[PDB]
Ligand binder design. Structure first.
Ligand SMILES: CCCCCCCCCCCCCCCCCC(=O)OC[C@H](COP(=O)([O-])OCC[N+](C)(C)C)OC(=O)CCCCCCCCCCCCCCCCC
Ligand SMILES: CC(=O)N[C@@H]1[C@@H](O)[C@H](O)[C@@H](CO)O[C@H]1O
Ligand SMILES: CC(=O)N[C@@H]1[C@@H](O)[C@H](O)[C@@H](CO)O[C@H]1O
Ligand SMILES: CC(=O)N[C@@H]1[C@@H](O)[C@H](O)[C@@H](CO)O[C@H]1O
Ligand SMILES: CC(=O)N[C@@H]1[C@@H](O)[C@H](O)[C@@H](CO)O[C@H]1O
Length: 448
């Protein structure tokens, strides 16, 4: 079913991912334990004997260079290279009735690893990863043995190198297999199944599909649907199929289909005399509108008023990448409610409320804050004499700054919660506007 939100991970973001998984993996290779190599020898220079390289331990492991691509259809293909692993151990060579001792160190270079990361989804809507077809190639070997024993080096090269090489690549590939299922899969699953938005509503971030590894991008599609906290009555399920074109500037782009609070921005509304706070000195009654229209109090002395306004356009243009400049243009008509119980037309106003919105990221949520500006009023028509627009403008401002703007400022400050795994921080928000969905551009940083 069509997802509410969609996390599109770009090639750039897959690159970050690999680099960061690379340091986690590197620490895990230290847990690798090599076996012990023992057997007999018959060196033509010193005779036959027994040897043993035991207590092998990973001492150095440097995994640098890597590459995360897309396997269109199944998932990702990882490739780490130009790495190095150092190995340390002890040896004992029994020649004669004597027994020797010493240490050794190997330096492995030109190390290459390749694994496939299979991305899928479990019934519960949680992510799953699985490494398949792992293969590593251990080659450039540097052997150093304690004591300047020459035959020991030649002996290593003739009878242990190849074995150690394969044993090692085999263990490294097993660490990778294990590490993904015991660390990686439990990490992707740190992604919220459900996040609270407000103390009233909530969103469900269950997967509607396993991440879709497209040719150039990775799309992880979430249910993303709003649901009542007390008992989620599914009164919100129309969400269409979205499809934004190719934006590869940043690491991830979120596509957020719908919200609730002023996401709709043909937005009609009504203002009744009993919708303005009591303490707030503004009221919708002829006697109060007397200064605006000195004639209303004659034609309709002491009566209730109606305002039926409506948005007719909401021009949005970017200032900063994360700062919008919208000015909803509306037309309001004043009605005086006469004893005939039927509203009756008085005047019509044109208003343009210039505002600035500036978004940010803060703790997995997208947050914003309003930046109030000039509210412009222009008389459109009037069947009750001239209208002091200048005076009324001051009231339009009082109203907004004391109602409309403080609330919206709160709605934004509460923010929307994004689908992220643990320890992630987003930066450089590029908030571009599109069809039914908001398209949030961001870069990522793993809180190591
Ligand atoms: C899933 C929604 C994503 C929405 C957008 C946000 C992500 C944007 C792109 C960056 C993703 C995160 C990168 C950093 C996390 C990955 C590396 C890492 O160290 O994770 C911590 C994990 C665990 O680190 P840890 O064990 O130190 O910490 C675990 C968490 N605590 C501390 C709380 C216990 O690292 C690993 O598990 C390493 C396992 C082997 C990794 C093998 C190579 C993996 C290469 C990257 C794969 C990325 C797949 C992305 C799939 C996205 C869809 C599900
Ligand atoms: C599309 C719609 O809802 N129709 C309303 C119409 O009923 C109302 O009389 C008018 C007032 O300006 O505003 C329109 O938006
Ligand atoms: C669409 C439009 O221009 N608005 C008019 C106006 O009288 C008022 O907003 C509404 C109330 O019924 O009726 C519409 O016809
Ligand atoms: C936080 C932010 O960037 N928003 C700014 C606002 O602070 C500034 O007063 C206004 C005028 O330049 O432009 C907005 O875009
Ligand atoms: C990081 C960020 O930009 N968001 C801040 C947040 O850190 C802070 O908690 C809040 C006030 O409490 O103000 C937001 O603007």
């Amino acid at each position: 079913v069509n997802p509410g939100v969609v996390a599109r991970i770009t090639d750039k973001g897959l690159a970050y991912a690999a680099k960061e998984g690379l340091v986690a993996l590197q620490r895990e290779l230290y847990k690798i334990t090599l076996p012990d190599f023992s057997g007999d020898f018959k060196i033509k220079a010193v005779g036959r004997g027994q040897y043993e390289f035991h207590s092998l331990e990973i001492q150095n492991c440097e995994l640098r260079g890597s590459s995360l691509k897309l396997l269109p259809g199944q998932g990702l293909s990882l490739a780490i290279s130009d790495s190095s692993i150092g190995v340390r151990g002890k040896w004992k060579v029994r020649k004669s009735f004597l027994k020797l001792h010493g240490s050794f160190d190997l330096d492995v270079k030109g190390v290459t690893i390749s694994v496939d990361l299979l991305l899928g989804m479990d019934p519960s809507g949680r992510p799953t990863v699985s490494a398949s077809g792992c293969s590593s190639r251990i080659c450039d070997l540097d052997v150093h043995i304690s004591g300047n024993v020459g035959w020991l080096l030649n002996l290593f090269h003739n009878q242990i190198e190849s074995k150690l090489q394969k044993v090692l690549e085999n263990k490294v590939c097993e660490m990778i297999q294990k590490s993904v299922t015991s660390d990686l899969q439990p990490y992707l699953q740190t992604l919220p199944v459900t996040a609270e938005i407000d103390n009233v509503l909530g969103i469900d971030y269950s997967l509607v599909a396993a991440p879709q590894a497209k040719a150039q991008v990775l799309d992880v599609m979430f249910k993303g649907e709003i649901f009542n906290r007390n008992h989620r009555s599914p009164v919100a399920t129309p969400t269409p199929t979205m499809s934004l074109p190719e934006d590869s500037k940043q690491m991830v782009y979120f596509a957020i289909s719908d919200y609730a609070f002023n996401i709709a921005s043909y937005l009609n509304f009504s203002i009744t005399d009993d919708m303005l706070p009591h303490d707030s000195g503004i009221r919708l009654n002829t006697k109060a509108f007397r200064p605006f229209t000195p004639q209303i109090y004659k034609k309709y002395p002491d009566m209730k008023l109606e305002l039926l306004g409506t948005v007719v356009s909401a021009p949005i243009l970017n200032v900063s990448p994360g700062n919008l400049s919208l000015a909803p243009q509306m037309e309001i008509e004043g009605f005086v409610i006469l004893p005939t119980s039927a509203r009756e037309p008085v005047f019509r106003l044109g208003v343009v409320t210039n505002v600035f919105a500036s978004l940010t990221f803060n703790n997995s949520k997208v947050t914003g804050m309003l930046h109030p500006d000039k509210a412009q009023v222009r008389l459109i028509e009037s069947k009750v004499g001239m209208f002091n627009v200048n005076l009324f403008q001051a009231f339009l401002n009082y109203y907004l700054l004391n109602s409309l703007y403080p609330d919206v400022n709160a709605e934004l400050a509460q923010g929307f919660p994004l689908p992220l795994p643990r320890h992630i921080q987003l930066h450089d928000l590029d908030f571009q506007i599109r069809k039914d969905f908001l398209y949030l551009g961001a870069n990522v940083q793993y809180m190591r």
